Amino acid sequence: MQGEIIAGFLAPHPPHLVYGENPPQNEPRSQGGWEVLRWAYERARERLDAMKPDVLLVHSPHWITSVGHHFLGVPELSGKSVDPIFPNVFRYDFSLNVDVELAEACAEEGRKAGLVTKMMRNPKFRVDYGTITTLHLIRPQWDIPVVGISANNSPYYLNTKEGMSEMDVLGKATREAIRKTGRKAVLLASNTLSHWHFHEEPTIPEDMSKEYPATMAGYQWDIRMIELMRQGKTSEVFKLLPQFIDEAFAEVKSGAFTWMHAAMQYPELAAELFGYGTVIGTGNAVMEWDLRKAGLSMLGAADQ
Amino acid sequence: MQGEIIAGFLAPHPPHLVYGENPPQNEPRSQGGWEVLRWAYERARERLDAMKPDVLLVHSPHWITSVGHHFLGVPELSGKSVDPIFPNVFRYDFSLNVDVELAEACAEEGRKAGLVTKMMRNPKFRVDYGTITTLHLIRPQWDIPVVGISANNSPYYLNTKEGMSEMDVLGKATREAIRKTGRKAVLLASNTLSHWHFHEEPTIPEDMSKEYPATMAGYQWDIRMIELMRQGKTSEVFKLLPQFIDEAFAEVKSGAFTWMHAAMQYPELAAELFGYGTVIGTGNAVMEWDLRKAGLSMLG
Amino acid sequence: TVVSAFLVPGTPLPQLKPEVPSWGQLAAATERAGKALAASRPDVVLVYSTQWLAVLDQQWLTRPRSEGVHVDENWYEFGDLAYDIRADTALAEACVTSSPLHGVHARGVNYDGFPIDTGTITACTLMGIGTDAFPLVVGSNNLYHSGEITEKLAALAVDCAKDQNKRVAVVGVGGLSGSLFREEIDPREDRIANEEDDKWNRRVLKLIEAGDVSALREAMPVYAKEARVDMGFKHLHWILGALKGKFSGANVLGYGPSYGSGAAVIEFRL
Amino acid sequence: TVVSAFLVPGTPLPQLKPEVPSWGQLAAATERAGKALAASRPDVVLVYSTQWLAVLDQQWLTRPRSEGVHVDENWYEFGDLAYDIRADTALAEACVTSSPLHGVHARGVNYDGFPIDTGTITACTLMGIGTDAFPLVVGSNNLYHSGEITEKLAALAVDCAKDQNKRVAVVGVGGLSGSLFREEIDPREDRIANEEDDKWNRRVLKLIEAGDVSALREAMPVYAKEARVDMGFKHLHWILGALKGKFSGANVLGYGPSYGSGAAVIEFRL
């Protein structure tokens, strides 16, 4: 048996997207909204639907930890996710399943590689809103086991460089765990790009005539950066990441983008852009790196 | 024999799109712009490239005619297309080739169908900035012959009802023409959706932080409309067209999107959305109706 | 400041196929207006053409010299319309400047190859204007401006000419009733489409010969709608505006058909 | 109007595992601060917590009764924090409204399930507040607010209370030096991470006891920066704003570590 990284997705977690879909799980009802980013997500949705993965691993910037990198560790987790910033658009009742053995294998490998890792064993833990938003946006059926990873403080407490360096080590430990387990998994980097925004509630939030890039500059970085990606110039986007982080206040500083790619070994592979758009001025790009198609998916023989 | 209409796709003519691309033929230069619509056309481009059509047929709202429906009729046409509203963004040098043989079959077939038609034989004639813009968006190579059709007055001079009727007939005549010529063609409906708009650029036309739907209501009309074509509920979008045109001032009135489907016999086929974006508040969507990969492209 | 005013047809038919009696008459009459214009010795010509369409900012031709060969989107079979239009950039640029000061955002248009409309071209050709002796200051027909706003653009412009101490001849280019035939006809049989449009064209025309500005302003809107008058007759509002809504008499030098639509050459008596 | 003031840690460690000596001592001090609170007989408790984050406009808690069980995303291994927090809707809502008046856009947050932060919860539990007798008026820590604006927000609240004739106990929830260990330790040997943080904590802590507002005022920004104090020590600014930059002195009921970070319980002598 071989372990595999079917693909890597840049899966932004804007709560507004689920709000405009009006799913059963979400309490507030909308008049619709953000259909571009939503349609963009319909694409990713079907791609994943075809993939039939064993598990979905997700790195969420809204589960902040100081002592190492944490991994969801209980079989089942449920709750009502209310977005603290956007309570009027996201109050989601969920219940999901965690691939604990893979989750533990990742912690294992991370520690082995020099990182401090922990297993979240409190069954009453409320999975963060970021994680729930992405999982819903990329897989509303909730039929895929998952492995939730915390976003360690390093990039902020220390500095972008040392932080990224840890995300990198996390990523290869993550790849190592996938194969040793023999899992066919998908990777979701729950990050947005330019994060400058509007500091105002637009009355009726779904008014798309009031939705646009917060700053021309931010919009520019976003376009520039994704162009490189769809151009397979992976090494060039990462050399630009630090400047992108600073000038655009891009959410990739949290580390999911670097963790996803480190696990994928920074493929100089062309990425597919399902779509781009803003939300509260924030730039969001829903993209994919199909490793199965590029023949870079298999990791190697599993253990046992 | 075996005339075929491979696919037909809604392909808007926003010059801002070519401007942001900075092609060799466009004189003014930008710092980019409208990437979302560009990427959407990029998808459309690939599709067309893999289509390998004999000819591209296009109907443009910017070649307005009072007396019947005209058709480009000289083999080689070229010139410098300068957008009159956006000359600071679109000044394009072009040179194209016309499939005169087919353009004539369309016209004759239109005549026999009860419509008045006319071939444009003047070699000095300057092709539309809209026709040129649309042609450039799906085929920057300028290597496929085309048949440029004019948008007859009927929708505006008479009314939407009697006007669309003419377009419908035109569409059917167009189909009959393709089928008799044995041509393997692709249709191009050059129409924007919602057409309410702003009033002048922010000095930097490409400043995307200033691009967004002109009106909430217009946006929703577009969304509702394109979503319906995606569901393949074609007959349903055509029931709403008049209301759509009325309420959102949709350019679909400005000639035909009706000609295309009429040519394709209004297939209840799910349309593929490449992307939806706003240009000056105006709603633009790039979609496709792949008849080949639907088993509806052959005419026999 | 203003020394002459004229309303001439925008249809290219008179210039293109004068051998057709009724069309040649219009051409000849437009030529006679040109002669009158020259005798008034203007320094500039304030033109507004029904076919020069603006959608955003008001537009003013600011390019020194424009030349080319225009082919009508509709009448391309009757021949070409070559032109060498010269503009008074100083006056035109002053109008671009004064416009926003009267509530109208406007800009100048100076681009090699910019599409000057058919009406403006045939007017220059037949009338002998747009020359260095008679440069033009052209103001676009913004589809969103009302008649009133059209008059404000014209008055606005007339003031700029006063400040530049220049003699202005004004010319509004456009047709009358617009019931354009919708099928091919023998040009030798052209005629106004209806008896209704004819009666209407004749009625307001007589009102113009009387200078009854008061009554004219009353009929204008009703007339525009019922006789499908070319672009709401805004090209007439152009003349009125530039003359401050007042003038006496007028001489209709020609009135005939243009593929169903009505067209005429009016010489105003300030 | 203000009858009491305290500063308490936002960490849940003292509450969750008091059997760990220094944590237990910190817990008992917080409890004592709670008794002093009640002894002051307040009608409302004006609370600001460093862990209640806002990034758009200012948030004020307006739900009458919020209850549930909260698990810390960092300290989950140490237990659950159950709560039944009561708010003074009338006063809170009055603060929502007065906010823009003082240049701060704000809103109320009243949603079943809303994420009350860990600091606000442990404070309510250990201090005995957030009860129907000691209702809360909690104002968010907006990431874009300076210490200055924080003071403006709290003075603005004390203002509304005086209007509604309510005695106010003010409580700032947050830590001191913020250098949390970045690896797992034996809780029993928890300690201040750096001697620099310990010294800095003792230093400003001394100033507070002394009531040396001026010196404390100027040391704050440097301290916050150098000892990585929890959210710029804005929870102290909140105390100051409520007291209008004036207080006689203070009694530090406890000072101990919380996974390397500094934490303390302060009772202010107005």
mmCIF file of N, CA and C in Angstrom, chain B residues 127-205:
data_model
loop_
_atom_site.group_PDB
_atom_site.id
_atom_site.type_symbol
_atom_site.label_atom_id
_atom_site.label_comp_id
_atom_site.label_asym_id
_atom_site.label_seq_id
_atom_site.Cartn_x
_atom_site.Cartn_y
_atom_site.Cartn_z
ATOM 1 N N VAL B 127 -14.641 47.600 -39.638
ATOM 2 C CA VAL B 127 -15.381 46.693 -38.774
ATOM 3 C C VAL B 127 -15.497 47.263 -37.352
ATOM 4 N N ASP B 128 -16.614 46.950 -36.685
ATOM 5 C CA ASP B 128 -16.940 47.402 -35.315
ATOM 6 C C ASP B 128 -15.867 47.202 -34.300
ATOM 7 N N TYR B 129 -15.790 48.138 -33.363
ATOM 8 C CA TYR B 129 -14.829 48.029 -32.283
ATOM 9 C C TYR B 129 -15.303 46.915 -31.360
ATOM 10 N N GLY B 130 -16.608 46.668 -31.366
ATOM 11 C CA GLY B 130 -17.157 45.615 -30.537
ATOM 12 C C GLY B 130 -16.895 44.255 -31.147
ATOM 13 N N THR B 131 -17.057 44.160 -32.463
ATOM 14 C CA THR B 131 -16.820 42.913 -33.174
ATOM 15 C C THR B 131 -15.339 42.588 -33.056
ATOM 16 N N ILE B 132 -14.507 43.608 -33.231
ATOM 17 C CA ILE B 132 -13.067 43.444 -33.126
ATOM 18 C C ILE B 132 -12.682 43.023 -31.703
ATOM 19 N N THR B 133 -13.265 43.682 -30.702
ATOM 20 C CA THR B 133 -12.980 43.369 -29.302
ATOM 21 C C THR B 133 -13.353 41.923 -28.957
ATOM 22 N N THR B 134 -14.554 41.504 -29.336
ATOM 23 C CA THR B 134 -15.009 40.144 -29.056
ATOM 24 C C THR B 134 -14.128 39.127 -29.751
ATOM 25 N N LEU B 135 -13.847 39.362 -31.027
ATOM 26 C CA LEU B 135 -13.002 38.445 -31.790
ATOM 27 C C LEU B 135 -11.648 38.276 -31.125
ATOM 28 N N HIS B 136 -11.116 39.369 -30.594
ATOM 29 C CA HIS B 136 -9.825 39.317 -29.933
ATOM 30 C C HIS B 136 -9.863 38.551 -28.620
ATOM 31 N N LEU B 137 -10.954 38.692 -27.868
ATOM 32 C CA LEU B 137 -11.078 37.996 -26.593
ATOM 33 C C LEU B 137 -11.030 36.466 -26.697
ATOM 34 N N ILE B 138 -11.773 35.857 -27.636
ATOM 35 C CA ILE B 138 -11.734 34.387 -27.792
ATOM 36 C C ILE B 138 -10.663 33.874 -28.757
ATOM 37 N N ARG B 139 -10.158 34.737 -29.641
ATOM 38 C CA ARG B 139 -9.143 34.321 -30.612
ATOM 39 C C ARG B 139 -8.136 35.404 -30.939
ATOM 40 N N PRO B 140 -7.136 35.593 -30.071
ATOM 41 C CA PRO B 140 -6.110 36.617 -30.293
ATOM 42 C C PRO B 140 -5.245 36.332 -31.522
ATOM 43 N N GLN B 141 -5.279 35.098 -32.004
ATOM 44 C CA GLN B 141 -4.457 34.733 -33.143
ATOM 45 C C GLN B 141 -4.949 35.268 -34.485
ATOM 46 N N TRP B 142 -6.219 35.655 -34.556
ATOM 47 C CA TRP B 142 -6.774 36.180 -35.806
ATOM 48 C C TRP B 142 -6.423 35.258 -36.969
ATOM 49 N N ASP B 143 -6.755 33.978 -36.824
ATOM 50 C CA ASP B 143 -6.454 32.984 -37.845
ATOM 51 C C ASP B 143 -7.662 32.169 -38.295
ATOM 52 N N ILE B 144 -8.848 32.558 -37.845
ATOM 53 C CA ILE B 144 -10.066 31.867 -38.252
ATOM 54 C C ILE B 144 -10.915 32.856 -39.054
ATOM 55 N N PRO B 145 -11.429 32.438 -40.215
ATOM 56 C CA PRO B 145 -12.241 33.421 -40.930
ATOM 57 C C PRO B 145 -13.528 33.674 -40.148
ATOM 58 N N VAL B 146 -14.149 34.818 -40.392
ATOM 59 C CA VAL B 146 -15.371 35.144 -39.676
ATOM 60 C C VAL B 146 -16.487 35.601 -40.593
ATOM 61 N N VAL B 147 -17.669 35.708 -40.009
ATOM 62 C CA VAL B 147 -18.845 36.205 -40.694
ATOM 63 C C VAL B 147 -19.382 37.190 -39.683
ATOM 64 N N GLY B 148 -19.276 38.477 -39.994
ATOM 65 C CA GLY B 148 -19.772 39.491 -39.086
ATOM 66 C C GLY B 148 -21.200 39.858 -39.444
ATOM 67 N N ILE B 149 -22.113 39.780 -38.483
ATOM 68 C CA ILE B 149 -23.499 40.129 -38.755
ATOM 69 C C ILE B 149 -23.860 41.432 -38.035
ATOM 70 N N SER B 150 -24.725 42.236 -38.643
ATOM 71 C CA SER B 150 -25.127 43.496 -38.030
ATOM 72 C C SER B 150 -26.356 43.272 -37.148
ATOM 73 N N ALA B 151 -26.568 44.175 -36.192
ATOM 74 C CA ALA B 151 -27.723 44.092 -35.299
ATOM 75 C C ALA B 151 -28.792 45.020 -35.840
ATOM 76 N N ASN B 152 -29.808 44.439 -36.457
ATOM 77 C CA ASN B 152 -30.879 45.231 -37.007
ATOM 78 C C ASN B 152 -31.699 45.925 -35.923
ATOM 79 N N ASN B 153 -32.149 47.120 -36.290
ATOM 80 C CA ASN B 153 -32.950 48.061 -35.512
ATOM 81 C C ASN B 153 -34.195 47.550 -34.827
ATOM 82 N N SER B 154 -34.883 46.625 -35.481
ATOM 83 C CA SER B 154 -36.134 46.107 -34.961
ATOM 84 C C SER B 154 -36.379 46.149 -33.439
ATOM 85 N N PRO B 155 -35.445 45.631 -32.606
ATOM 86 C CA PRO B 155 -35.669 45.656 -31.153
ATOM 87 C C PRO B 155 -35.964 47.049 -30.597
ATOM 88 N N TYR B 156 -35.277 48.055 -31.134
ATOM 89 C CA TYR B 156 -35.449 49.436 -30.684
ATOM 90 C C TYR B 156 -36.468 50.256 -31.469
ATOM 91 N N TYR B 157 -36.463 50.125 -32.796
ATOM 92 C CA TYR B 157 -37.385 50.891 -33.634
ATOM 93 C C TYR B 157 -38.815 50.394 -33.486
ATOM 94 N N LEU B 158 -38.980 49.071 -33.492
ATOM 95 C CA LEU B 158 -40.293 48.454 -33.333
ATOM 96 C C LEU B 158 -40.456 48.197 -31.843
ATOM 97 N N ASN B 159 -40.045 47.015 -31.402
ATOM 98 C CA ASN B 159 -40.096 46.651 -29.987
ATOM 99 C C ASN B 159 -39.395 45.323 -29.797
ATOM 100 N N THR B 160 -39.105 45.003 -28.540
ATOM 101 C CA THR B 160 -38.409 43.772 -28.191
ATOM 102 C C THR B 160 -39.058 42.515 -28.759
ATOM 103 N N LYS B 161 -40.383 42.455 -28.704
ATOM 104 C CA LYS B 161 -41.124 41.298 -29.195
ATOM 105 C C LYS B 161 -40.933 41.093 -30.698
ATOM 106 N N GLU B 162 -41.287 42.092 -31.505
ATOM 107 C CA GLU B 162 -41.128 41.977 -32.957
ATOM 108 C C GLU B 162 -39.652 41.948 -33.342
ATOM 109 N N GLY B 163 -38.817 42.558 -32.506
ATOM 110 C CA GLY B 163 -37.388 42.582 -32.770
ATOM 111 C C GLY B 163 -36.762 41.214 -32.557
ATOM 112 N N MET B 164 -37.059 40.590 -31.422
ATOM 113 C CA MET B 164 -36.515 39.272 -31.141
ATOM 114 C C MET B 164 -37.014 38.269 -32.178
ATOM 115 N N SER B 165 -38.222 38.479 -32.688
ATOM 116 C CA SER B 165 -38.753 37.571 -33.700
ATOM 117 C C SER B 165 -37.840 37.550 -34.919
ATOM 118 N N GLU B 166 -37.382 38.728 -35.326
ATOM 119 C CA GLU B 166 -36.488 38.826 -36.469
ATOM 120 C C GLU B 166 -35.182 38.101 -36.187
ATOM 121 N N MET B 167 -34.655 38.294 -34.984
ATOM 122 C CA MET B 167 -33.411 37.657 -34.581
ATOM 123 C C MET B 167 -33.567 36.142 -34.590
ATOM 124 N N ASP B 168 -34.719 35.676 -34.121
ATOM 125 C CA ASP B 168 -34.996 34.249 -34.105
ATOM 126 C C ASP B 168 -34.945 33.719 -35.539
ATOM 127 N N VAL B 169 -35.634 34.402 -36.447
ATOM 128 C CA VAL B 169 -35.645 33.968 -37.832
ATOM 129 C C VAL B 169 -34.225 34.005 -38.372
ATOM 130 N N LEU B 170 -33.500 35.075 -38.057
ATOM 131 C CA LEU B 170 -32.121 35.222 -38.511
ATOM 132 C C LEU B 170 -31.334 34.007 -38.055
ATOM 133 N N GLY B 171 -31.514 33.638 -36.787
ATOM 134 C CA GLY B 171 -30.818 32.487 -36.237
ATOM 135 C C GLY B 171 -31.077 31.229 -37.042
ATOM 136 N N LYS B 172 -32.348 30.982 -37.338
ATOM 137 C CA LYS B 172 -32.728 29.817 -38.113
ATOM 138 C C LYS B 172 -32.130 29.884 -39.511
ATOM 139 N N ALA B 173 -32.143 31.067 -40.113
ATOM 140 C CA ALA B 173 -31.581 31.205 -41.448
ATOM 141 C C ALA B 173 -30.093 30.902 -41.368
ATOM 142 N N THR B 174 -29.478 31.327 -40.271
ATOM 143 C CA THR B 174 -28.055 31.108 -40.054
ATOM 144 C C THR B 174 -27.735 29.615 -39.980
ATOM 145 N N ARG B 175 -28.596 28.877 -39.285
ATOM 146 C CA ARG B 175 -28.439 27.443 -39.132
ATOM 147 C C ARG B 175 -28.554 26.815 -40.515
ATOM 148 N N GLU B 176 -29.639 27.125 -41.218
ATOM 149 C CA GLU B 176 -29.855 26.586 -42.554
ATOM 150 C C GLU B 176 -28.635 26.827 -43.425
ATOM 151 N N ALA B 177 -28.041 28.010 -43.279
ATOM 152 C CA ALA B 177 -26.857 28.378 -44.047
ATOM 153 C C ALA B 177 -25.670 27.485 -43.704
ATOM 154 N N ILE B 178 -25.400 27.317 -42.410
ATOM 155 C CA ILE B 178 -24.289 26.477 -41.965
ATOM 156 C C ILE B 178 -24.463 25.041 -42.494
ATOM 157 N N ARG B 179 -25.673 24.511 -42.330
ATOM 158 C CA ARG B 179 -26.023 23.161 -42.753
ATOM 159 C C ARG B 179 -25.890 22.922 -44.258
ATOM 160 N N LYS B 180 -26.162 23.940 -45.069
ATOM 161 C CA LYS B 180 -26.040 23.794 -46.519
ATOM 162 C C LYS B 180 -24.593 23.954 -46.990
ATOM 163 N N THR B 181 -23.797 24.709 -46.244
ATOM 164 C CA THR B 181 -22.404 24.927 -46.612
ATOM 165 C C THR B 181 -21.535 23.786 -46.098
ATOM 166 N N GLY B 182 -22.058 23.045 -45.125
ATOM 167 C CA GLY B 182 -21.301 21.951 -44.541
ATOM 168 C C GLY B 182 -20.197 22.483 -43.640
ATOM 169 N N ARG B 183 -20.343 23.739 -43.228
ATOM 170 C CA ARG B 183 -19.365 24.394 -42.369
ATOM 171 C C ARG B 183 -19.403 23.895 -40.920
ATOM 172 N N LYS B 184 -18.233 23.844 -40.300
ATOM 173 C CA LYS B 184 -18.122 23.453 -38.903
ATOM 174 C C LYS B 184 -17.844 24.786 -38.209
ATOM 175 N N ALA B 185 -18.890 25.388 -37.650
ATOM 176 C CA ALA B 185 -18.767 26.703 -37.034
ATOM 177 C C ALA B 185 -19.023 26.839 -35.538
ATOM 178 N N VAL B 186 -18.690 28.020 -35.018
ATOM 179 C CA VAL B 186 -18.911 28.362 -33.614
ATOM 180 C C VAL B 186 -19.622 29.715 -33.612
ATOM 181 N N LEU B 187 -20.657 29.841 -32.796
ATOM 182 C CA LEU B 187 -21.402 31.086 -32.725
ATOM 183 C C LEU B 187 -20.891 31.979 -31.604
ATOM 184 N N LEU B 188 -20.952 33.286 -31.825
ATOM 185 C CA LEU B 188 -20.493 34.251 -30.835
ATOM 186 C C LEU B 188 -21.548 35.310 -30.565
ATOM 187 N N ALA B 189 -22.133 35.274 -29.372
ATOM 188 C CA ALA B 189 -23.134 36.262 -28.999
ATOM 189 C C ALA B 189 -22.402 37.360 -28.222
ATOM 190 N N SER B 190 -22.143 38.486 -28.877
ATOM 191 C CA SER B 190 -21.428 39.581 -28.241
ATOM 192 C C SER B 190 -22.378 40.533 -27.504
ATOM 193 N N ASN B 191 -22.828 40.124 -26.320
ATOM 194 C CA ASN B 191 -23.737 40.942 -25.522
ATOM 195 C C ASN B 191 -23.409 40.882 -24.045
ATOM 196 N N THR B 192 -23.465 42.029 -23.380
ATOM 197 C CA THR B 192 -23.217 42.081 -21.951
ATOM 198 C C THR B 192 -24.580 41.774 -21.368
ATOM 199 N N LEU B 193 -24.641 41.610 -20.054
ATOM 200 C CA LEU B 193 -25.912 41.350 -19.395
ATOM 201 C C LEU B 193 -26.385 42.705 -18.902
ATOM 202 N N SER B 194 -26.505 42.860 -17.586
ATOM 203 C CA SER B 194 -26.921 44.124 -16.981
ATOM 204 C C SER B 194 -26.083 45.258 -17.565
ATOM 205 N N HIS B 195 -26.719 46.327 -18.034
ATOM 206 C CA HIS B 195 -25.931 47.402 -18.618
ATOM 207 C C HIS B 195 -26.020 48.760 -17.944
ATOM 208 N N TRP B 196 -26.447 48.783 -16.686
ATOM 209 C CA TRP B 196 -26.493 50.047 -15.965
ATOM 210 C C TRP B 196 -25.012 50.301 -15.697
ATOM 211 N N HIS B 197 -24.590 51.561 -15.668
ATOM 212 C CA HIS B 197 -23.168 51.840 -15.474
ATOM 213 C C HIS B 197 -22.814 53.137 -14.757
ATOM 214 N N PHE B 198 -21.515 53.295 -14.506
ATOM 215 C CA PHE B 198 -20.963 54.474 -13.847
ATOM 216 C C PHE B 198 -20.905 55.600 -14.873
ATOM 217 N N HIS B 199 -20.185 56.665 -14.532
ATOM 218 C CA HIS B 199 -20.014 57.804 -15.428
ATOM 219 C C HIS B 199 -18.586 58.348 -15.305
ATOM 220 N N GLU B 200 -17.713 57.739 -16.110
ATOM 221 C CA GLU B 200 -16.280 58.022 -16.227
ATOM 222 C C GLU B 200 -15.381 57.298 -15.239
ATOM 223 N N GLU B 201 -14.161 57.028 -15.693
ATOM 224 C CA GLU B 201 -13.164 56.311 -14.913
ATOM 225 C C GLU B 201 -12.579 57.149 -13.795
ATOM 226 N N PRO B 202 -11.967 56.485 -12.801
ATOM 227 C CA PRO B 202 -11.349 57.143 -11.648
ATOM 228 C C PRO B 202 -9.948 57.636 -11.981
ATOM 229 N N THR B 203 -9.773 58.097 -13.216
ATOM 230 C CA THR B 203 -8.488 58.602 -13.685
ATOM 231 C C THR B 203 -7.579 57.436 -14.046
ATOM 232 N N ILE B 204 -7.659 56.364 -13.262
ATOM 233 C CA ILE B 204 -6.875 55.160 -13.512
ATOM 234 C C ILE B 204 -7.906 54.082 -13.812
ATOM 235 N N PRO B 205 -8.362 54.000 -15.071
ATOM 236 C CA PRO B 205 -9.360 52.990 -15.435
ATOM 237 C C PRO B 205 -9.135 51.589 -14.875
#
